[PDB]
Amino acid sequence: CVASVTDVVDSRFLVHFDNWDDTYDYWCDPSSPYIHPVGWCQKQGKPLTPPQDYPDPDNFCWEKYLEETGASAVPTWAFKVRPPHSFLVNMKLEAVDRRNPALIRVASVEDVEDHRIKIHFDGWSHGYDFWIDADHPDIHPAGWCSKTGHPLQPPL
Amino acid sequence: WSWESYLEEQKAITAPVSLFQDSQAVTHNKNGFKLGMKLEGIDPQHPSMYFILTVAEVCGYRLRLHFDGYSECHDFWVNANSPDIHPAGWFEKTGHKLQPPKGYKEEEFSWSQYLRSTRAQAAPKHLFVSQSHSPPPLGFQVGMKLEAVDRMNPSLVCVASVTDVVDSRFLVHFDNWDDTYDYWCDPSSPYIHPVGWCQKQGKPLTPPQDYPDPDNFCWEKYLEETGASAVPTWAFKVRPPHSFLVNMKLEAVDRRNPALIRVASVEDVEDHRIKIHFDGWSHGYDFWIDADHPDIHPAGWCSKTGHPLQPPL
Amino acid sequence: WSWESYLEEQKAITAPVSLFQDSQAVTHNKNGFKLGMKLEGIDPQHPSMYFILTVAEVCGYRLRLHFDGYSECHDFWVNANSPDIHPAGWFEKTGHKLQPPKGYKEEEFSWSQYLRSTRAQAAPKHLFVSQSHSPPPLGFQVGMKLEAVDRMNPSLVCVASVTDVVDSRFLVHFDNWDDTYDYWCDPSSPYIHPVGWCQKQGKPLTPPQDYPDPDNFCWEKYLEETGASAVPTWAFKVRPPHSFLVNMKLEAVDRRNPALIRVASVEDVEDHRIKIHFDGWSHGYDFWIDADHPDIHPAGWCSKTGHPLQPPL
Amino acid sequence: CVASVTDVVDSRFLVHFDNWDDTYDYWCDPSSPYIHPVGWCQKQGKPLTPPQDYPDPDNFCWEKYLEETGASAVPTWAFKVRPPHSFLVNMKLEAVDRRNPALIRVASVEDVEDHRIKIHFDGWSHGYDFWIDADHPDIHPAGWCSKTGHPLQPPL
Amino acid sequence: WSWESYLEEQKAITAPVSLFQDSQAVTHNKNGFKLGMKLEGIDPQHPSMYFILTVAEVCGYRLRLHFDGYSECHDFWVNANSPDIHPAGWFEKTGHKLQPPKGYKEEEFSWSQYLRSTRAQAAPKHLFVSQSHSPPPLGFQVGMKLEAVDRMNPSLVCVASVTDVVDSRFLVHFDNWDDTYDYWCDPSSPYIHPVGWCQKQGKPLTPPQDYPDPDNFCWEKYLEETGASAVPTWAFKVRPPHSFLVNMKLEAVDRRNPALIRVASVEDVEDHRIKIHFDGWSHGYDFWIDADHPDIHPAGWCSKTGHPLQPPL
Secondary structure (H helix, E strand, C coil): CCEEEEEEECCEEEEEECCCCHHHCEEECCCCCCCCCCCHHHHHCCCCCCCCCCCCCCCCCHHHHHHHCCCCCCCHHHCCCCCCCCCCCCCEEEEECCCCCCCEEEEEEEEECCCEEEEEECCCCHHHCEEEECCCCCEECCCHHHHHCCCCECCC | CCHHHHHHHHCCCECCHHHCCHHHHCCCCCCCCCCCCEEEEEECCEEEEEEEEEEEEEECCEEEEEECCCCHHHCEEEECCCCCEECCCHHHHHCCCEECCCCCCHHHCCHHHHHHHHCCCECCHHHCCCCCCCCCCCCCCCCCEEEEECCCCCCCEEEEEEEEEECCEEEEEECCCCHHHCEEECCCCCCEECCCHHHHHCCCEECCCCCCCCCCCCHHHHHHHCCCCECCHHHCCCCCCCCCCCCCEEEEECCCCCCCEEEEEEEEECCCEEEEEECCCCHHHCEEEECCCCCEECCCHHHHHCCCCECCC | CCHHHHHHHHCCCECCHHHCCHHHHCCCCCCCCCCCCEEEEEECCEEEEEEEEEEEEEECCEEEEEECCCCHHHCEEEECCCCCEECCCHHHHHCCCEECCCCCCHHHCCHHHHHHHHCCCECCHHHCCCCCCCCCCCCCCCCCEEEEECCCCCCCEEEEEEEEEECCEEEEEECCCCHHHCEEECCCCCCEECCCHHHHHCCCEECCCCCCCCCCCCHHHHHHHCCCCECCHHHCCCCCCCCCCCCCEEEEECCCCCCCEEEEEEEEECCCEEEEEECCCCHHHCEEEECCCCCEECCCHHHHHCCCCECCC | CCEEEEEEECCEEEEEECCCCHHHCEEECCCCCCCCCCCHHHHHCCCCCCCCCCCCCCCCCHHHHHHHHCCCCCCHHHCCCCCCCCCCCCCEEEEECCCCCCCEEEEEEEEECCCEEEEEECCCCHHHCEEEECCCCCEECCCHHHHHCCCCECCC | CCHHHHHHHHCCCECCHHHCCHHHHCCCCCCCCCCCCEEEEEECCEEEEEEEEEEEEEECCEEEEEECCCCHHHCEEEECCCCCEECCCHHHHHCCCEECCCCCCCCCCCHHHHHHHHCCCECCHHHCCCCCCCCCCCCCCCCCEEEEECCCCCCCEEEEEEEEEECCEEEEEECCCCHHHCEEECCCCCCEECCCHHHHHCCCEECCCCCCCCCCCCHHHHHHHHCCCECCHHHCCCCCCCCCCCCCEEEEECCCCCCCEEEEEEEEECCCEEEEEECCCCHHHCEEEECCCCCEECCCHHHHHCCCCECCC
16 A cells, blocks of 8 residues: 655654554564565556545556655665564464463464464464564563563463 | 763863853753644755755754655754744745745645645644744845855955845845855844945955946945845944853754764854864864854753763764 | 634624625735735825835735835835736836836836846736726726815815726826825725716815816816816716624724734724724724725634734733 | 436436435536535535535535445546636627516626626616526527527617 | 765764774885785684785785685785784794695794795885784783683683783683684783683683583683683773764775775674674675774775775665
């Protein structure tokens, strides 16, 4: 989708979707694999969702939207390559339980994508398995709990 | 670090607050400017022209402004109490020309439409010290003529005009030249003088560029010819020499990177200018500045407004 | 402050927009006049004469005009839709006399040369509501005669002529007098009447100053003598009495300082005039004004055009 | 205002104001300067008048209303630009008398707008002047009455 | 390309000359080294070992050295004020072993015979800053033991010995490990600590390689067994952190192509190290370097010494 930077704080910035709520916004850095330069959709083949309630949606032109909004496109040299993570299936780690975030549990890598891992809580049903970004703040190496003084939930 | 400790070890004093203009010293005003807010302001390199500007960054009582539609390389820093920025709609209400965002035409631009299209907020009016809601400076009306020192070539006193008036200040323009050499000032500016000052004082007057018979320049006939009146002599006020002394310490924006403000010292003085030295750095970076320049401040200014202070090297 | 709240606490209403002429009410036109721009206009104190004028100040939909070459004390305020200003070159194209800037001669003045010499911009034509590009008002031709009330001495109805025609308006001149008592109007003006109105109505007719045998004045022979025709009776249109009522509130320029516009109230009414009172001030400042005067406006006018509104005292 | 197409006859359609008296309905064609696609008011910053007796007049929303009503918007492409007419002030013509429509009078163009002319009947008071759309069936070129055999009322 | 123009373009500052050690900043010394001269020096990869070396190239204040008898793929660059090179005859007068040119035996090499065989000239003694004539590092004697950070594996603090003393520096050697881990330092080095430091800090101590009983390494017993003393605690000096700041610009030798020196920036700081980034290049080439390293230099060093500077990109 068509997006803007609406906030900059130290090494990070806020991605906002044009003509929408802040509900769908998210913080990231220049190496985020979720962001791309102006003209990426057309060059790659996939269609671009234009701003909500925009006049003539299927007839959306970037260069004229930019001129119109007195905005410049983020320059292509700004978008950095983050390599795929190197987590492998069955590696174990510690992860905050999303059903009760006070708790951190023994966990396992159940599956992988380029930039995401699927977490499984050891001893619990696979139904609680969830996808998470590899750089998410709520996953941690084994030992993290013990060395910081937070209880670790053992497996069931 | 701390000023208190630094002054002990250096056996020095800070320039007292009373030596500064209220506007250079004031720390208790909140910076209400926020990221993305839209406004109008002068282009520093072309001080006669106005542009649409966006708040790109805020740092304490300072902000960095971006020229909508244009490159980020032209971004510049001002203080939140800058008189050279104005609220959306100000150009239209006060007889100023808007240079619109890149790709627009002067009369194609509407604030209403622009805000709908960008979904941006205009910086609220109450943020601005200068909105042309104050009666002008005494005796300086647009079109009126005076003598003015070319600040870029200070060995020249030249034929000049007032071409802009905004609250207590006015724009000095050099006749038949670019706006590149123009500058904003007030009636107490030590750089301006009444018609007939050159002849009375002895120094020669540079007449307008490409003027017929330059050495044969007559003020009273230039005035009649241009349907202009000279600014009246009672209008030009005495500003006393500043009272800064060598070795007084203060805070100053680094001209090599204006995002930064540093510990500094008065290295030398003139009647209306001081020479700044950045403590711990080479004297080669020393620069002359007007005593009433917005980018010098009393010790403590950074700490009380929330802007980082670069300690000495 | 706010009008909405003020009307609640005072338990009053504003004069509705529909009560005003479109020209007194219109807020959606941009003021395109800019500082330093040059133009032509009438001198308010001598409404038959035209001068070169410079835009000295803009405030919302109003501007202050300066008489080139002359003192700033004669500066005056008009609205941007004033019919009494015209673009550069208008005098020459429409048969009007230019009083040139102080020190020039009528036929020594060229706009081309003046603009080259001043390096000024002429206010563009498209800014002006009145440029003589519209066919005149019906039946009022220059030289034609009528009866007119001396607005300065309203107990007099006098021999008068049309001496100027510009778009929908014309200049009423009193014969054998100064232009000092002249005034602009339209065919619906309640101050003008056809030849023979005095005799038919009963009141006496003041004949021209220094006329031979004043009490023995005959219209039909004055006409033959001056090779003039009377304005035809079908030309004089009925303007209905205005519908302003006592206590209606509105906005009005302060005559003691015309830069200012204030909250005001209708204190009293006549058929074609209202008595203005500035809310919060003494009744001693109350003044009579024509209902179609350009300097009265509906509540909200200031806010919608960008001009400050003085709240009540 | 919120409106609907309620009739289609040959090259024209009838515009109806949702839940208002049918006396406000009018016939037009795709080029009419009085109609606009759903969303036009929002795009222009103009207030939109909702249907009469709308259950929640504060928060009228087009998307919800269309869904609730089982209705589609006329697509934006259907709306055509009609060029302004070329009548000029003081041109003369023939016009039917609004007050006595049996009669057709000598008339003049008193004023112009982009799509309308103000008619003045020669010799009569300006108080009888009226605005009329330029495409209105009851204005005609000079000579129309004589050529069709209708009496023409002279000025006065 | 100029530094001045680039700095202005980037609103950037160079690291001042005052932040560098004199030896890194000095530009006014002449390079007296000439092509084909012979000398002695350490192998940078095996810093305890000494070889016969020949000047293969000179570039400003730098020279490329060739290992006599060996392949040119081992050539390396030093500055002309390098303390890691010595004049012919030095090894024999100071108790250092020579690794002779490929195919010679150590007892078989004689400088006088070699110079005669090659018909070459020995670099003159006056070129060399280090001839082992200056005062030794207080408290550090050959054979004395200490705790040292493995700079190749900096999580490890290890049993180490002083194995060489040359002028004001000494060589740290890791007991029974490859000499490739040895490094030269001075008493102020942040990488060395007195015997017992790990114990006092609660850090694990890495014992010598192949230590007979690695479980129970004990310093007292080891010192006794080895006939060795500890370097006394008083000899160890606090070195203050450097004063480089992030984004300051400088010049740095390219690690991958050491013939070249590039425009560089301080990407990050630590107390005794800076992370270097080459302007215009990928951040993947960034590297950490000790602040006292001979191959970082102030802006202007190349131009003043006559070495080409690679511009950004």
